[PDB]
Amino acid sequence: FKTFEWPSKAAGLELQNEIEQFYYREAQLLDHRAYEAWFALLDKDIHYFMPLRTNRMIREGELEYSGDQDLAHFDETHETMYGRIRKVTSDVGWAENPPSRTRHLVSNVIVKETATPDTFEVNSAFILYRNRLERQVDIFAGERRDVLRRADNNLGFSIAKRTILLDASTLLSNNLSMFF
Amino acid sequence: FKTFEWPSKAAGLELQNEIEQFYYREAQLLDHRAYEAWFALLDKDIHYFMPLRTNRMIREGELEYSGDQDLAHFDETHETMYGRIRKVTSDVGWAENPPSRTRHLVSNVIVKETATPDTFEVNSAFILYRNRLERQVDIFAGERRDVLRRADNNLGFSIAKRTILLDASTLLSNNLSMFF
């Protein structure tokens, strides 16, 4: 995972706006626990991936992220995301019953065209603020690398791929019961 | 307080830009303690509101927020906002003398038209970082739901209504001596 390879000519003002608004809408769905509405955004071939990140000497910097055949925090398909949505909406799903209060602050949206029409590669930054129970606070920061396809839904896009690069080695939270 | 009911057709780019810029200007006033200039933005019929939030089992989720008949963190009129501005600019207002150092990071801006021309319902997310005295740090996250009216001032708009949804049950700060 190198620096995002942004195009030299930046996406037009309207596309930039469309994609930022999509993310703003997605964050509203997540921060208001609209879990089924959010899951409808996931394409049947979704790869939803959050690799492990480690402390390496500069000499060994290529080993910073876990690989495709390694463990990860998330490595999910449509089928496995569905199990999680079933859990998070469950009365017996203790981790989110009572539910947490989250904020997804989204910025640094960089838009890039792909070889396929209406399919975009998107880079963005976020801070996920999670408040839980009486006094629990977990702050996450990172970037998302998405593949988005235009779609005839209330949001204008669907998610084809998502990778989350989290700024953490050891997770400071007791869990990741939220969605990125 | 469900997902913000964003309009199907996005705001025009110019309108989108104007309202984001309003918010950036507002943040600069607050973070630079231009309290007189900020209060000038409050319309006479301002309702400035920050409800309490509680932990609830999912099956009782509708009781999450406090209503109009209950206590709140804020529930203000122009009159009472005035008193607060008098206190915060006062040499004997200990909580803010020495003043705190704040940053209002504003993002996720979604603009929605109303039945009144030049009046807009606006959703947005924030992180308010507050640093005070030697080592005190309080971090807040949430969203704001505003009603803004077009105005002939230095900012372009006035605030007719503001609801702040704070991501917190128990406040982890000793006070709310800051403005949202």
Add this chain to the structure above:
Amino acid sequence: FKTFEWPSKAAGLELQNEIEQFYYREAQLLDHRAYEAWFALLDKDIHYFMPLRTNRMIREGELEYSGDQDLAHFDETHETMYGRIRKVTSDVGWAENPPSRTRHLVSNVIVKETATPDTFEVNSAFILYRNRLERQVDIFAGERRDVLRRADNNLGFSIAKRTILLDASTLLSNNLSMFF
């Protein structure tokens, strides 16, 4: 340092987008440790400044920030930034070997023109999240006041001046081994 003097009439959409995209690209360089590419953005006449900030009573508000003849957190020329780049990219630079993991979330971009053509005075807000080693997390907030010049490089602009106003008195971090 008073409220940023934004122009009454806002920057056009295109200009607003170009400068925001510049910052998102700059943030990606920094967060992926592209230090040599980042340093190339700094002009021969760069002044890179982060004053101290003190607790003062309102009557002594004019003394909040250190001055040009005082100590600061940073007060850098092209030559001194060059030495900092050689340290951060060095194998024996322990503070950043192993490197930290950073996120520069950028927002609140206000653009103001100058007398000189293609030169812009720019205000913005940031949260910088720094995670390091096993468990260390340092969160910084503040604003940047830049002087940017149109440049024929990969990013669109070069940095002529940068002043960082950090919302801190005592620094809660053990160091500032990152760039703002």
Add this chain to the structure above:
Amino acid sequence: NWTPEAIRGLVDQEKGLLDPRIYADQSLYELELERVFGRSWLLLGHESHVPETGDFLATYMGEDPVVMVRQKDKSIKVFLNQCRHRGMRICRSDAGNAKAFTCSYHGWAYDIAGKLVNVPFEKEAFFDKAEWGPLQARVATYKGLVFANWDVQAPDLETYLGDARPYMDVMLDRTPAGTVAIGGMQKWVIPCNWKFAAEQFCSDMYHAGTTTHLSGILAGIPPEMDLSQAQIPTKGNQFRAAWGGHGSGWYVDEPGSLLAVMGPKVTQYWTEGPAAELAEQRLGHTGMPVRRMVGQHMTIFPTCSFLPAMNNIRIWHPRGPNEIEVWAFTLVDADAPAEIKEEYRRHNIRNFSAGGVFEQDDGENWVEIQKGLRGYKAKSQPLNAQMGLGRSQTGHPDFPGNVGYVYAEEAARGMYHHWMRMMSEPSWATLKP
């Protein structure tokens, strides 16, 4: 280890001296949880927080989480929010309505009385369930306010309250309809010791009549008026309880502070008209001219504080020597007019929430005090509680009990003196009234 001798020497009510270690020492903190919070009557809320069968409030007694829950027979039960199997929280939300409670860890099931009624796989693995339910507290109600105590030996609530009751009735006993809690409970965190918070409401009109709340007052006066015109009340009295470390203070005849705080409609309601007449009638047995009382503070030891005319109530939950949580709510007369209930709501928000124009300045002081007490020399010399020393009298014609001037620390010395007694006297035989 703290000897009873060493403990008695922390507080000197005759000289008016307090050892600052009381606010910071970790060992004294752990002893307080046993010797003070483990056997005092602690406030949990109002009857109206749990009006119907199965309604519950999750709260604290010390750092012990507890569940307050209305029973079918209309009684209120209070038990420890901890499963006796492996310690899991039984009731996991703030409030609501329950038909039963179930431990989310291994499924041990409890009726709304806190009785263990089911243990999964009991026959195949086991023991009496009637001995393995969560620890019950004693529950007593004083005119709406719900109190609890772990200790079976402790005096009953009424005896424990003693001659403090008249000053509670000022707020609680103004109508046959009784009080009700406005909805919602505000919660926030302050890095100070509980005793600073408890003392201020017990004894400290001083701070409101001096410098702390100048800006609070300024927020509440008319825009046309400035502080140079602000009407200073200096007429008033202070009560120290016969036993228990309770205390109250109030202004007399001078509506300056009440009017700034609660506005004209509440001030007029508290002092003039049908409701104010009936209240004085209803409180005649104590003899108090309650309509001349304009702004009152009070603490029921250790951690139940309230402001009668303003009807703000708080519970201070200790979180170590260096932290507390404040849980706040407000009461109104159940039969008060809609316009008045609305005034109490808005002004309680404006003045006494975490964003309150009064509250803000309180926490700012407490925070710095506690930070100072990290220092060695900051703890090496006594603090001064000599104000009003030897100036109180038990024969006042208007107000019952041990009464002095409004700016005094007689109630304070009583609070610290009783704290000391509870800390140094292991057995209720000696401690009781």
Add this chain to the structure above:
Amino acid sequence: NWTPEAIRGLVDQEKGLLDPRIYADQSLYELELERVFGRSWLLLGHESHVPETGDFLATYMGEDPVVMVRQKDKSIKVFLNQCRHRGMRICRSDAGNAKAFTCSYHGWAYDIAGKLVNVPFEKEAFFDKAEWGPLQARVATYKGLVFANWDVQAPDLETYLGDARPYMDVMLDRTPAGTVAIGGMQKWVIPCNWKFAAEQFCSDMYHAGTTTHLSGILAGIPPEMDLSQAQIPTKGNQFRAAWGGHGSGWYVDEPGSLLAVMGPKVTQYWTEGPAAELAEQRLGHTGMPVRRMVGQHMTIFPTCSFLPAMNNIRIWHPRGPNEIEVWAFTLVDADAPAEIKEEYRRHNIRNFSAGGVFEQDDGENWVEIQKGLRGYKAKSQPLNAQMGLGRSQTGHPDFPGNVGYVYAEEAARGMYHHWMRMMSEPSWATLKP
């Protein structure tokens, strides 16, 4: 002070009672670091984590950071990650390959065996380097796993493990090629005592058969099937190690749990076909019907836990009485088809990562438990460990050792009994098996 007498009183395996102070007391924690972690065999990982000469892994033995490194002679050494000059961390990255280690502070240089080979300016300023290398631990492997112990007087690993070995071999000894670790070591922080975690995996099938993991199961069953249809396993056994506080539990014959956790392909591999029959054959010397064992949990005391059918392994790193770090990895049979390895990887992530549909609910329980223990009354009464009291016996035809029913706390009692023994017996003379 914590005398042997007092320590003995914290656990009672006869009556099945636990003093909850064991989970919260700071003094007891400091003793644990000395009396337990200072002299137990601790899991550091797997041989395949450090496959080549100079390959290293930075990890912990309690709160002592250590380096595990592959030697030139294919042996593995573990030494304290701390320079004896002024305490600086010698190895500053998580893992990798080294030719040598050099302290970043004053340049003291070490070979990959921990030996001090260069001190800058030694001739000008000095002392025998051979005496000044970081402290070395004893290192022993058991079928791929790397254990370490500081104590030269402690039993060897084989003796320490005792009759727990057959139950380890179910996971570790199935194929002549051995096991290998999937790449990746997950790490996360839970604010709870290490004993809650170690006991759960030691003895607590009960929580997974009652309420904790109902949504975890729900997440794994077919989309069309709902919770009611999920067959409830109630058949199985629990083992308590003769000596050492080790324990294990498993389901027999009912594969519903394993099917939802690991899916059909892995369930198939574990129970039917060539690889499954080879496992039973290799383990025939135990007489255990391994193919009938379908879902298992085990703890090797103190902090090495694993789930043999699913091959999830965890090390609990204590961080005071109120916190742990969880470090997790997974093992596969080295000669298992690639398809099966991918399945093991996928479902471990899905189920047992920090975001895991199982893991999520464990941390939620533990978090609230530790929080309860801040209260005075919450620590004042024993916790119930009476499940299966008296019901275990040593003659089971299928599974050797002290064996009882799957839903029991005989293994838990054994663990806390052994914890008590290490805490109260200074000498291995009385402590060893």
Add this chain to the structure above:
Amino acid sequence: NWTPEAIRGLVDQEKGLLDPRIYADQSLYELELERVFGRSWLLLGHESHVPETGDFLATYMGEDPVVMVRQKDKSIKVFLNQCRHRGMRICRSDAGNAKAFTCSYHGWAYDIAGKLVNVPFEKEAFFDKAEWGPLQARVATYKGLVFANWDVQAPDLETYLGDARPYMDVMLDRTPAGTVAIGGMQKWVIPCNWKFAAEQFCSDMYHAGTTTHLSGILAGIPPEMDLSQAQIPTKGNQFRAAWGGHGSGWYVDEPGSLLAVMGPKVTQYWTEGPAAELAEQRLGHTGMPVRRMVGQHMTIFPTCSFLPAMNNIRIWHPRGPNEIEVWAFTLVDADAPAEIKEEYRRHNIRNFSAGGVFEQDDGENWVEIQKGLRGYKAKSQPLNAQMGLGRSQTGHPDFPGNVGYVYAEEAARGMYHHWMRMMSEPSWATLKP
């Protein structure tokens, strides 16, 4: 308990062994606040920080907040920033000018000397104001630098400094004009014991001559020059004070590292020309060849550190065993050219602030050391302080006092030895020089 005998055992200057518990033990820390910080001379700053009547600086002595304030008669007072009424901070900003101070809690007003001059409602509620002002510290000056001490039995400043004074004069007495502080004081937090920091600046040139700062030098050399060509001095000496734990170390003749840190303009200013010649004139009688000293570090025990040729001064404020605050400022000769002043300011920021190319790497090392010391085995063996053992001499032909090589730990052994003495000897009858 920490008895004298136990405390004496923690440090062995004859063998050169340090018990690592000294850096981590909470109990030792609390004794330190009493026995070290409670009776040592602590640096508060420079006279020019409070140049005019009523100018104040809010600082610390240990964890006691104090106020340093210039008086009309030109003396400086230091009092505890704590109101004796209920403990509130009297002076609530970092620095400024005051005509008086008023407590924000109950309005107790103090003059700029910290005398209690007005108690609101004194006549009507009260006791002697003269006896109830904040505790006062002894204040003493040495060539610009302001020290304070609480202990009225402690030796005076000059006697406390002893034969350290000539090494201080190398920075502080170069001109009849004296020094002046550049504006601004940097403040940052490092989670490490204060003793690591004090020792480093007392005795540790070794860390700069080996590995810590290889990248700092790299940042300060010409872009054309690479590390292999950088001029690493190996020539110089180290001073151990005759009494008090003070120490210094310096490079001799070889200007390589000073040039890399301070640039050519400052290096030439220090070493050649009229200013350097005047300094040699002024100081030569002390027996010191100041112009040959090219890069120097010093500590005045406990927490006053400085770097004479770079004029970087720092105060270490303890915050428990596991944390400090660093408060940094820089000095210049009052009469130095504007250019040289500017160079001192730029290069101090570049090198020595929280973002400094030197400072970054010190914090990085210290953070790891302290983290290591949470481990039990990490604190179980002594640390090596054997460098330069028996190699120092008191009749050195070029340098005064007890002098050895630049790379030695004699000045460190002296520091910890005096620390040990302050911690075990409770009377200044035995402790004094």
